[PDB]
Amino acid sequence: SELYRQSLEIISRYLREQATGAKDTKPMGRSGATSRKALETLRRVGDGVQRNHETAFQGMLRKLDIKNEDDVKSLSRVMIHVFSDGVTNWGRIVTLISFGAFVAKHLKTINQESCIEPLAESITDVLVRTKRDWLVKQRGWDGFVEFFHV
Ligand SMILES: Cc1ccnc(-n2ccnc2)c1-c1cccc2c(CCCOc3cccc4ccccc34)c(C(=O)O)n(CC(=O)N3CCNCC3)c12
Ligand SMILES: [Zn+2]
Ligand SMILES: [Zn+2]
């Protein structure tokens, strides 16, 4: 669907920019203004989450103990568990994606950057496939952008 593809583009762009520090100039495409606004929202709100929850993020990264691609496969089990537990909302979705960026930065640091794209795919899979009903009900990325109104 466009929801999956839109979500993948936003999340992948955010993780790549976080990991590399570089901004992608290629147009978003279909939901341009909204996708661009969603990415900007992740930049601002996600920075806040990474900073304000740095202690937990650093501790979690240590727990995952990522050395290679095999460890990146193993964290998908943890991701789907922790995220699926309890009630979802945009705050938890930002935590999911912001932590993804935090992990992606680590992957850059250890020179295993090729895992960033599959990680973004994994995050998108868990978000869109498992919470489709909630996302649709809450107006998808339009809803996300309006909720935070950065
Ligand atoms: C597990 C944990 C324990 C204590 N404090 C935490 N933490 C994170 C920020 N502040 C605390 C967290 C915590 C750490 C990292 C992410 C989250 C999330 C988002 C969904 C899970 O995301 C991932 C898990 C594993 C690997 C991943 C790799 C890439 C991207 C995402 C990954 C949550 C959540 O869904 O709420 N939590 C739990 C959390 O925030 N809690 C705090 C209060 N008590 C336990 C629940 C994560
Ligand atoms: Zn926290
Ligand atoms: Zn806490």
Residue numbers in the entry: 172 to 321
Provide the authors' own sentences about this structure as they appear in the paper:
Using this construct, we embarked on an extensive co-crystallization screening campaign spanning structurally diverse ligands and broad matrix crystallization screens. As the co-crystallization of MCL1 and ligand 1 would not be generally applicable to other ligands, we explored a protein engineering approach to develop a more robust MCL1 crystal system. As an initial proof of concept, we re-investigated the co-crystallization of ligand 1, which in earlier efforts relied entirely on zinc-mediated interactions between ligand and neighboring protein. The structure of MBP-MCL1 was determined to 2.35 Å and has high overall similarity to the structure of MCL1 173–321 (superposition r.m.s.d. of MBP-MCL1 and MCL1 173–321 bound to 1: 0.58 Å overall, calculated on all common Cα). Interestingly, in the absence of the zinc and pyrophosphate packing interactions, the pyridine ring rotates 180° from the previous non-MBP structure, with the 4-methyl group now pointing toward H224 and the imidazole group facing out towards solvent.
Specifically, cell death-inducing mitochondrial permeabilization is prevented by tight sequestration of membrane-localized proteins by anti-apoptotic members of the BCL-2 family, which include BCL-2, BCL-XL, BCL-W, A1, and MCL1. Consistent with its frequent amplification, MCL1 is highly expressed in many tumor types, and high expression levels of MCL1 contribute to tumor development and resistance to chemotherapy.
